[PDB]
């Protein structure tokens, strides 16, 4: 796993499962479309766009998703599949997010970036 935080503070680690195409990545102001599955360290699944059967779209770099996501997706290329290990300070913090996410929980997300546009 590679630490992708600005100062490498250990808050967001990334492991590429499948390399994407090229080197171009989505930037702030773009709308990305992805599929994802989120689980706790013990495997407990708390969210998934795949189970809903609908790709998830959001505007990158505007704080519309947890900090670990704005950081992680910005490092992905088209078609890439990556696993992010997100410490709570880049996730839901000390309060957590009921009903399944306790405070201080490290989140594991597997994300597949399909495309993006302005």
DSSP conformation letters of 26-81? --TT-EEEEEEEEEETTS-EEEEHHHHTS-EEEETTTTSS-HHHHHHHTT--BT-E
**Cα distances (angstroms) measured from residue 51 to each of 48, 56, 100:** 5, 11, 16
**Technique used:** X-ray
Closest CA to 116 of 39, 68, 55: 55
Tally the residues of the chain.
Answer: 118
Q: Which of 84, 86, 92, 108 is catalytic?
A: 92
Contact between residue 14 and residue 4 where contact means Cβ atoms under 8 Å apart: yes
Which tokens sit at 67?
């900090």
Contact between residue 49 and residue 34 where contact means Cβ atoms under 8 Å apart: yes
Q: Is 114 a catalytic residue?
A: no
Q: Which of 66, 86, 101, 108 is catalytic?
A: 66
CATH class of 1-118: alpha beta
Collapsing DSSP states into helix, strand and coil, what is residue 77? coil
* C-alpha to C-alpha distance for 34 and 56, rounded to whole angstroms: 5
CA 114 centroid distance within chain? 13
Q: Is 92 a catalytic residue?
A: yes
Collapsing DSSP states into helix, strand and coil, what is residue 88? helix
User: Where do the structural domains in the chain lie, given as residue ranges?
Assistant: 1-118
Q: Which of 3, 46, 58, 114 is catalytic?
A: 46
- For strands 56-59 and 107-117, give the pairing: unpaired
**Torsions phi, psi for 51 (to 5 deg):** -70, -30
């Amino acid at each position: 796993k590679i630490d992708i935080t600005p100062k490498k503070d250990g808050g967001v680690l990334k492991l590429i499962k499948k390399e994407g195409q090229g080197v171009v990545k989505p930037t702030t102001g773009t709308t990305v479309k992805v599929h994802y599955v989120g689980t706790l360290e013990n495997g407990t699944k708390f969210d998934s766009s795949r189970d809903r059967g609908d790709q998830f779209s959001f505007n990158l770099g505007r704080g519309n998703v947890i900090k670990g996501w704005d950081l992680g997706v910005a490092t992905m290329t088209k078609g890439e599949v990556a696993e992010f290990t997100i410490r709570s300070d880049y996730g839901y913090g000390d309060a957590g997010s009921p009903p399944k996410i306790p405070g201080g929980a490290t989140l594991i997300f597997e994300v597949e970036l399909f495309e993006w546009s302005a």
